[PDB]
Every structure is written in structure tokens, then in C-alpha cells.
Ligand binder design. Structure first.
Ligand SMILES: NC(=O)c1ccc[n+]([C@@H]2O[C@H](COP(=O)([O-])OP(=O)(O)OC[C@H]3O[C@@H](n4cnc5c(N)ncnc54)[C@H](OP(=O)(O)O)[C@@H]3O)[C@@H](O)[C@H]2O)c1
Ligand SMILES: NC(=O)c1ccc[n+]([C@@H]2O[C@H](COP(=O)([O-])OP(=O)(O)OC[C@H]3O[C@@H](n4cnc5c(N)ncnc54)[C@H](OP(=O)(O)O)[C@@H]3O)[C@@H](O)[C@H]2O)c1
Ligand SMILES: NC(=O)c1ccc[n+]([C@@H]2O[C@H](COP(=O)([O-])OP(=O)(O)OC[C@H]3O[C@@H](n4cnc5c(N)ncnc54)[C@H](OP(=O)(O)O)[C@@H]3O)[C@@H](O)[C@H]2O)c1
Ligand SMILES: NC(=O)c1ccc[n+]([C@@H]2O[C@H](COP(=O)([O-])OP(=O)(O)OC[C@H]3O[C@@H](n4cnc5c(N)ncnc54)[C@H](OP(=O)(O)O)[C@@H]3O)[C@@H](O)[C@H]2O)c1
Ligand SMILES: CCCCCCc1ccc(Oc2ccc(Oc3cccc(O)n3)cc2)c(O)c1
Ligand SMILES: CCCCCCc1ccc(Oc2ccc(Oc3cccc(O)n3)cc2)c(O)c1
Ligand SMILES: CCCCCCc1ccc(Oc2ccc(Oc3cccc(O)n3)cc2)c(O)c1
Ligand SMILES: CCCCCCc1ccc(Oc2ccc(Oc3cccc(O)n3)cc2)c(O)c1
Lengths: 255, 256, 256, 254
């Protein structure tokens, strides 16, 4: 994986603990040119500070809230004018209301359910449509999911249904964009201590059950996700699309 | 497998005699259940009043419920409860997506189209379950209808496939949540059946015929077949089964 | 929920009153089926002659078949055919692995242990199906018993897990092959049940209790619950279902 | 970079073998490679094919995986000759041609268990013996096909053997995880190899991939090799018990 002369858009860095910053450090270390998108002003500030650790000689930062079609459309169009065609997109974006990530899934509100779908699943479809315009000769799109999209995990509740939606999204996008030589895949990351992890009830209980029960008897980190992302975003994974790679110490393979 | 006499089921989503849910109704009715029907469009009520002539139900229990409205789901079930009392389960046979999005390129799906399909085809189960639970104090069974395009990308099913993926996860999270209440939640993954909603899906006839040539039983299924598995899932025969997706599709799920 | 009168089923693998297959037998018997039993060990026949006193079967049809022997399977079914005629289906409840291989380290499994488990626990279905087909000229249903350890690595299930993986693929390939003959083939994935064979699995009690705490219905299943799903799978209720794995396990398959 | 790494590749018969794709990728990335073969003809092919790789020494070992002794003694000797290894690529399977067509229900006991023995059990014993040369961990990769997860017409007994293999990878993953040995599978799409000739309807499947798979094309041996390099390297730390489909997306569609 030399990724020199490649360009990747990484969506969803908030701080140094973000999964997407793991991805960024690995891709940066392999020589990629990187372009970052953020929602909150504070995330841009963190990005300007985190770019000091990377070898990127230019900050390419774009504010994109994926709840707005205009921002996604205009964001990518402007990325295209600033750096040209890209080779792929790492999508590391999700949200649900804290009200809905605990207690009873059956009490989820319509508004909470559709908010989680909108940000955590639909965003991939529209990002893919707009990113395709910058990948005339192909490339690779990777989204971040969690095992709670494949099995009902206590407390993950509405986000689980959104990740089920996301994972089907990857498959329908794979099928649709295949002929354009655009691969679409997911990484199913094991639990990692991030800012968004604080929203999920029982998160610490899960970290520790991974250590005791997963095959490798340890938890994974953001850089491990990043290394599999580099695989999925590079020519190493030619032939792989519509796939869900579990970066979770083997926890998916056990019961 | 003796008998759904003294049982009461709510069947949601009959539009006409070709509806999957009318297969369910004919099987449950024939097994002695009391049945309660919910519909969105006035035309669906008219069809129901005519179809009830074929069933043995001595009383039409018809309730208008558009699952896009919380109020209608809340008030519909509350009124069902006042009219027939506690129920034993719910058959959910409801989905929708815009035709624009069921043939396009999936990557061109609109936000509004995507969320409409989630709202009607997935979220409706969650709120129906929450309101139906109140009429199942001693437990019961909820069954939703899905299709193989929620587990694999099937050409043309597009936005409805992502909605069925969402629905299938919905069944599992509901199973987990309502299990302690002795409410089982399951899905039937029906093979393609000629219905009014089938007309919305591009390439539907091509799929019917590939089932005949390739599925293990070399034939397609019908609405009554779905109904017989629904009776299993809604009865004590399936005690112990929850969070499950039963494929009623001539074995097509098992091949490649 | 009608009737298995005028139907005939072969139930393979009753050893005692706690056998999963005796759950199946009590449900099918209660529904009016004629039943035919096969056993390996002389003690299993003795248990069967005593257990038949509880059933309504007016005639003991008992046949010794060790599924490691082609001759015994071929001659057993041929003789069943001469004694009761055509059958409607087969419940297969047979497995074995050496206790040496059901604990500690899967990587230390012996070739002989591995192939023994495949032979008895998987291949037996294929040859039983081939011989049973001859007694189902107009179609029928075959059901095998599996466990979640065939789909995921469960500690201590080790070699039997690979055998159940093999068995589950077996059901699918058999479904595809025998589908055109209108013979459906399916599996029940039973949750853990206190049986004589359960004693061979390390950590069995630990698993029973984790089901109670974590599975959706917060309780374990029993043999009769397996039997009720078997009646579904062996009857016309499940027309349209083949190549399927129904989990009778309090929903434990659906969680993580 | 796989310099200073050593891998054992099991199951090259000729230049079209999946395992030779693996070899060309690992060789190109600087790995030291060790090869195992069954038939004398495969050794001859290997001595000729090694001329195309950059390996400065042929390390060839005869191992028929039906024999415990040959597996035990093969690996023990590999250890004495090159030292500790970093992983194993297993590309071995067999079933009788009689059983890879017509009716699966007519499969013989001997055919069924032969396919289990060579195509599934071989991984367990290879893993047990390879573990002894991976004191500080490593990676084991086996080759499977979609017919282990769904019933594919004509794949018949080999399908049940791949189902067994795939569960084998998961039980091995669980068991050897604590030893920092990862175990995974690659599910390769159809590739024109010597063993492909034994499967009825193989050409029909190649062409349906081109028309229906997402990428509208078939994969090749080098593509399998590139994902093997991922799985055998530190890039895939955190991944075990997994089945990666290198099949143009065909697994994701119905
Ligand atoms: N940590 C884990 O246990 C784990 C495990 C499996 C999967 N995942 C997935 O990994 C991804 C990244 O999450 P993380 O755990 O790394 O948390 P994180 O650092 O909090 O990153 C989450 C990102 O989502 C972005 N986001 C939320 N709504 C957005 C919107 N409307 N528009 C644009 N961006 C939006 C946030 O940006 P702002 O801060 O600027 O709002 C933030 O950068 C998520 O998809 C998550 O579901 C995480
Ligand atoms: N036939 C098939 O090929 C097939 C295969 C697998 C699964 N399914 C599933 O089977 C279920 C029923 O479809 P079908 O094939 O039976 O078609 P159908 O006869 O057209 O019934 C669909 C029902 O959806 C109802 N509906 C849609 N939106 C609604 C809303 N917002 N509120 C209340 N009801 C609403 C319709 O009621 P109104 O007419 O009153 O609007 C109609 O009764 C669906 O979930 C579908 O996805 C169908
Ligand atoms: N109990 C559980 O937790 C559990 C859970 C999931 C699945 N299962 C499955 O349920 C099935 C029945 O097991 P069980 O728990 O009911 O135990 P069981 O009561 O011990 O019955 C197992 C049967 O296997 C038979 N058997 C073994 N080798 C045989 C052979 N070569 N030929 C003919 N019969 C042979 C035994 O007959 P003889 O005694 O006469 O030798 C015995 O009747 C098995 O497939 C098992 O894998 C059990
Ligand atoms: N080609 C495909 O479409 C495809 C797709 C998915 C999976 N696969 C898998 O890929 C792997 C390699 O197959 P291939 O297609 O590359 O065919 P191949 O080049 O003919 O390789 C198969 C190898 O298996 C070896 N073998 C068989 N029995 C053995 C034994 N008892 N001991 C030691 N070696 C033994 C053969 O050695 P000899 O030459 O000396 O007999 C041969 O080198 C297999 O696991 C196969 O199932 C292939
Ligand atoms: C019970 C499961 C514990 C392991 C869950 C692992 C996990 C951790 C974090 C994940 O990412 C998010 C992102 C946003 C999110 O919603 C949030 C986060 C913070 C505040 C807020 O209001 N909502 C919840 C989880 C994620 O998808 C999955
Ligand atoms: C890829 C073709 C084979 C699969 C089609 C089988 C099938 C047929 C019908 C199904 O149900 C619906 C229900 C509503 C729906 O959306 C519609 C229907 C009519 C008009 C309209 O505007 N939208 C699409 C499918 C369904 O979920 C699945
Ligand atoms: C750690 C798993 C806990 C639940 C296992 C439940 C279970 C219980 C019994 C099962 O059936 C058998 C049948 C034979 C068998 O091998 C035996 C049994 C007794 C003695 C012996 O020498 N071998 C092991 C398990 C089975 O497949 C699964
Ligand atoms: C109908 C599906 C066709 C695509 C199957 C792809 C495939 C191709 C080759 C595969 O590898 C083998 C290896 C040995 C084998 O058994 C053989 C090979 C040659 C001669 C013989 O007697 N048996 C059959 C297939 C394999 O596992 C899978």
C-alpha cells in the first residue's frame, strides 16, 4: 500500500480519539493526500491542531453537515475544484439521541428513529452520489458500522436499526456503483473509547466483556480500524465489494 | 396444533383479495381466530367489507390506521382494546416506497424517499409494538413481512431493501426488548407474490420466473403459504421462537 | 392447527424420556401421527418400549439403525417401508463426538475424532435422506437437529460445532437436490436442553444459565417446544419452507 | 513490507493455482516463502515456477495432509530449516469427481469423509503443527468458496466440506486467539484452475459472475493474493474468525 498520488476524503473526525483520526494517521503515513470534512466549529479547531501531527503539507477542511443535501453537494463540488478527482471516501459519521440509546427500544420516537436513519445511513447514499462525480475512473468508499446492526445488542437500540440500514446501504451502493468501478464496503469496529461512545449506555460493560470473551482477549483501537481502511481504500482489496470486515478481535465469530 | 378459538389477532395491511395479509386472514379465520383489521385508504375498507363475506368472522372489526400518524396508531389500538379486549398478536403487512426510487439507481435515492420508506416500512413496527403491548398483558406474538432484499442487494428493490434491512433489525431489537414481557417478535420473508404493491417494483416478473427455475421447490409461493407460517408464528406452536426470520420462499434464500 | 392423522413419521434418536426426539414424539403422537422409532443401543429400545406406554400409538414400530452402517440404514428403511408403507417424513435427532474432543482445545482434535463426529452427526442425514426418499414418492419433510455452535464458535462445543456446520450445509444441499421431488429439508436449532448427551459437553450448565440471563425470553426451552416446531416443519403448515434453520432458543441467536 | 517475514504456502500444483497468486504477491512484497506439495509432479512445477519468483532458495516440502506424520514431520523440518514462521496459506481441497455433479443425496460415506478429511480437517492439524513455529503469534489463511454458505448446484459434497472448513476457521480463531494467532478465510470467486475442471457447470458460473456480480467481472489469483497479504500481515491486526469475499461482490447479491 503506497498511497502516494492518491487522495481520500475522510468524513467525521471530531478529536484525537475519533476512529476517523486512526484512519487519517494510517493513510497519511502511507503518503495519501487527505481532505477532511466536519460538522461543528470545534471539530475544525481539533482538525487544525491534529494536522500538526500529520505530514499533510496543506489543510483541506470543508464543513459538511450530512443532514443538508446542499452542504454535501457543494462540499464535494468544492473539494473537486480544490484538489481534483479523488480515489475514495472514509465515512465515519453517525448520530442518535441519547434519550433513545438506553432503556426500551420499543419506546423510540419517530423523530429519533428517522434522525438516526438520516445521519447514520442516508448520509452514505448521498455522499456516494456526490463523491462518484470525482471518481470518473473508479475508487473506494468505506463506512463504519458495529455488530449491533447484525444482532440486537442491549442499549444500542435505535443505532442498531440504523447500522442495519447502513449495512444494506453499502450492499445496494456496491451493486449500483460496481459497474462504475467504485467499491463500497464497511468496517465493523469493535468498541473503542470515543466521544460518541459516551452516549451509549453500558459501553464500559461491553469493553470488558470483549477482553474476556473475544478470541484475541483484547480490545481493538482506532489505528487497527485505520489499517483495514487502508486495505479497503487501496488496490489491495480489488475484487472486494459489498463486504463488512469485522475489526473486533474476533468477537463477531463467537457466541 | 389444535386451534386458535378464543384468540384475537389484529391484521394490518389488507388492500384486496391478493394481499399477503388476506392469506394470513383466511388461514387464521379458518383456525377459529377472532380477527380485527386495520387499513389506510377508504378503498381498502370497502375491499375488507366485501372480503369479510368469505370469512367466518361474525363481526367486522375495522379500524383506520395510517402508521405515519402516532395518534392514529395510539388511538386505533386503544379503540381496538375497548371494542374486543386484550389481543393475542399482530400481523404487520405494511410497506411503502415511492415508485421513482424502485428502479432508479439506488445511489440517486432522495432523502425524502429514503426516510418515507423507513417511516412506513420499519418504524411503523416499533410504534405498533409499543401500542399493541398494552393489549397483551399476559404476552403474545407480533409478525412482520419482509423480503430477501433486506439481506442481499436485489436489483430494483433499492430503497425498499434498505427499509427491510431496517425492519429485520427492528424485529430483533423488539424481540430483545419485549421478550421479558413474553411477547415474541418475528418476520416472515415471503417470496415474490403477485400483489398490487408488486406492480411498484421494476423487474418483478423476471424474479417470479427465476424462482420457478432455480428455487429448490421449482415453484413460487402464495399468500396462503405465508398465512400458514404466520399461524405457526402467532400460535403457541412457536413458543421458544423469537427474533427469527422464517423464509417462505421455496428455499430460494438457501441457494446461490 | 389441524391434524396429522393418516400421516406416518420416522423419529430417529430417542435414548430416554429426556431425549429431544421424545419431545417430538409426544407432540406428533398427540396430533394423531403414526410413529416409527429407530435406535442404536439395546438400552434405547428398552426405554422406547417403556415410553410407548405414555403415547397413544397402538403398535410399537421399532428398528435398530446405527447410522455408521450403510446396510443398517438401507435395510432399516426398506423394512420400515414393508411394515407401514410410505411415510410422510423423518425427524433426525442423532449426533456423537468423543468426550475427549468436547473441552479444552479444538486445535488438538484428532482426525479420527473429527471424522467420527462428521460421520454420525452430518453424513447420517444424507444417507437417511437417500433411503427415506424411496418411501416418499409423493413428497414429504425431513428435519435435523442442530445447535447455534454450528454458526458461531461456542467455547467447548469444538468438534461438534464443525459437525453442525457440516449438518446445516447438508440440509441446504439436500433441500436443493430433493426440492424437485417435493421433499422439504430443514433444521431446528435447539437451545441447550438437559439431556444424556448434554453431559458430554463441558460448560453445559454455564450456558444454560447465561441463556436465562441474556436470551430475549429470559428462560430456557424444552424438548416439547422443539417438538411443536418439528410438527410445523413436518406438516403442510410449512409448505414453502425448505433449506431453513429455525431457532428454538428463546431468541438467543438474535443477540450479542 | 513483508521483509523478514516467512510464510508457508500449501497447495501450488501449477502456474494457475490460487496459491501461486498468493506466492507472487508475498514474494513481490519481500517475504521468504516455503512451499508444500503432495504429488511429485507438483514439486516439478514448483521448481520451474520458483524461477519466476525472487526467492533465492527453494524451500520445498512434501506434505500429504491425509497423513498426520507428514504434516507433523514436514513442519518440524520447516522449523529446523528456516526457523519460526509468521503464517500459513492453506490452499488445499479435494473431493471425488463422481460426487461433484448430479445428486448430492447419492454421495457415498467414503466420498463425504474424504472431502472433510482433506478440505477441512487438514486445516486443524496444519494449525496445531504450525503453532509450534509461531511462539510470538502469526496468521493462518484458508481458501473457501460461497458454496460453503449457500447450496450451489454441482458443488455438492465440496460445499459441505467448505461449510465445515469455515466453522473450522472460527473454532481455530477462538482457540488460538490467546496465542496471538489469527485465523481467517478468503472466499474466492470462481477462477480457472486445474481443480476447477473437476466441478460440473464451472464455465456456466464464470459467465453468470460477469453478468450479475457488482463489478461485472471475474477475479483472479493475484486478487486473492493481495487480500491474503492483508490477512497475513499486521494490516489485519484485530481481524480473526473472518471470511473475506474476493468475488466481485457476488456474495452480496441475490
Ligand atoms: N467508538 C466505537 O465503539 C465505534 C464502534 C463501531 C462503530 N463506530 C462508528 O464509528 C463512526 C465514528 O464514531 P466515533 O466513535 O469515532 O465517534 P466520534 O469521534 O464522536 O465521531 C463521530 C462523528 O460523527 C459526526 N457527525 C454526527 N452527525 C453529523 C452530521 N450531521 N454531519 C456531519 N458529521 C456528523 C461528528 O462530527 P461533529 O463532532 O462535528 O458533530 C463526529 O465527527 C460512527 O459511524 C460510529 O457509529 C464507532
Ligand atoms: N407481494 C410481494 O412480492 C411481497 C414479497 C415480500 C414481502 N412483501 C411485503 O408484504 C407486505 C404487504 O405487501 P403486499 O405485497 O401484500 O401488497 P398489498 O396488498 O399492496 O398491501 C400493502 C399494504 O400496505 C398498506 N400501507 C402502505 N402504507 C401504509 C400506511 N402508511 N398506513 C397503513 N397502511 C399502509 C396498504 O394499505 P392501503 O391500501 O390502505 O394504503 C396495503 O394494505 C409488505 O410489507 C411487503 O413489503 C410483499
Ligand atoms: N440437548 C441439547 O443441548 C441439544 C441442543 C442442540 C442440539 N441437540 C441435538 O439434538 C440431537 C439429540 O441429542 P439429545 O440432546 O436429544 O441427546 P440424546 O437424548 O442423548 O439423543 C442422542 C441420540 O443420538 C443417538 N446416536 C448417536 N450415535 C448414533 C448412531 N451412530 N446411530 C443411531 N443413533 C445414534 C443415540 O442413540 P443411542 O443412545 O441408542 O446410541 C441417542 O438416541 C442431537 O443431534 C444433538 O446434537 C441437543
Ligand atoms: N478456483 C476456484 O474457483 C476456487 C474458488 C474458491 C475456492 N477455491 C479453493 O482454493 C483452493 C485451491 O484450489 P485451486 O483452485 O488453486 O486448485 P489447484 O491449483 O488444483 O490446487 C489444489 C491443491 O490441493 C492440493 N491437494 C489436494 N489434496 C491434497 C492432499 N491430500 N495433500 C496435500 N495437497 C493436496 C493439490 O495438490 P496436487 O496437485 O499434488 O493434487 C493442489 O495443489 C482450494 O481450497 C479450493 O477449494 C478455489
Ligand atoms: C451497548 C453497545 C456498546 C458498544 C457500542 C459501540 C459504539 C460506540 C459508539 C458509536 O457511535 C455513536 C455515534 C453517535 C451516537 O449518538 C450520540 C453520541 C453522543 C451524544 C449523543 O447525543 N448521541 C452514538 C454512538 C457506535 O455506533 C457504536
Ligand atoms: C426486485 C423484484 C422482486 C421483489 C419484489 C417482491 C416484493 C413485492 C412487493 C413488496 O411490497 C411493496 C410495497 C410497497 C411498495 O411501494 C409501492 C407500491 C406501489 C406503488 C408505489 O408507489 N410504491 C413496493 C413494494 C415487497 O416488499 C417485495
Ligand atoms: C458449550 C455448549 C453448551 C450447550 C450444548 C448443547 C448441546 C447438548 C447436547 C448436544 O448433543 C450432543 C450429542 C452427542 C455428544 O457427544 C457425546 C455425548 C455423550 C457422551 C459422549 O462420549 N459423546 C455431544 C453433544 C448438542 O449438540 C448441543
Ligand atoms: C458449481 C460451482 C462452480 C464454481 C466452484 C468454484 C470452485 C472451484 C474449484 C474449487 O476447488 C476444488 C478442489 C478440488 C476439487 O476436487 C477435485 C478436483 C480435481 C479432480 C478431482 O477428482 N476432484 C474440486 C474443487 C472449489 O472449491 C470451488
Amino acid at each position: 500500500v503506497n498511497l502516494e498520488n492518491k487522495t481520500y476524503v475522510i468524513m467525521g473526525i471530531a478529536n484525537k480519539r475519533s476512529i476517523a483520526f486512526g484512519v487519517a494517521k494510517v493513510l497519511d503515513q502511507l503518503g495519501a493526500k487527505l481532505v477532511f470534512t466536519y460538522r461543528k466549529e470545534r471539530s475544525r479547531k481539533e482538525l487544525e491542531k491534529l494536522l500538526e501531527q500529520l505530514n499533510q503539507p496543506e489543510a483541506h477542511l470543508y464543513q459538511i453537515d450530512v443532514q443538508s443535501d446542499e452542504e454535501v453537494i457543494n462540499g464535494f463540488e468544492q473539494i473537486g475544484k480544490d484538489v481534483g478527482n479523488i480515489d475514495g471516501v472514509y465515512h465515519s459519521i453517525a448520530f442518535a439521541n441519547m434519550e433513545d440509546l438506553r432503556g426500551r427500544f420499543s419506546e423510540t420516537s419517530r423523530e429519533g428513529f428517522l434522525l438516526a436513519q438520516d445521519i447514520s445511513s442516508y448520509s452514505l447514499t448521498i455522499v456516494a452520489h456526490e463523491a462518484k462525480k470525482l471518481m470518473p475512473e473508479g475508487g473506494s468508499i468505506v463506512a463504519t458500522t458495529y455488530l449491533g446492526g447484525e444482532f440486537a445488542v442491549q442499549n444500542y437500540n435505535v443505532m442498531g436499526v440504523a447500522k442495519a440500514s447502513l449495512e444494506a446501504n453499502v450492499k445496494y451502493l456496491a451493486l449500483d456503483l460496481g459497474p462504475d468501478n467504485i467499491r463500497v464496503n464497511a468496517i465493523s469496529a469493535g468498541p473503542i473509547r470515543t466521544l460518541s461512545a459516551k452516549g451509549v449506555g453500558g459501553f464500559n460493560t461491553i469493553l470488558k466483556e470483549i477482553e474476556e470473551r473475544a478470541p484475541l482477549k483484547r480490545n481493538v483501537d482506532q489505528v487497527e480500524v485505520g489499517k483495514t481502511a487502508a486495505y479497503l481504500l487501496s488496490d489491495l482489496s480489488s475484487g472486494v465489494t459489498g463486504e463488512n470486515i469485522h475489526v473486533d478481535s474476533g468477537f463477531h465469530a463467537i457466541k
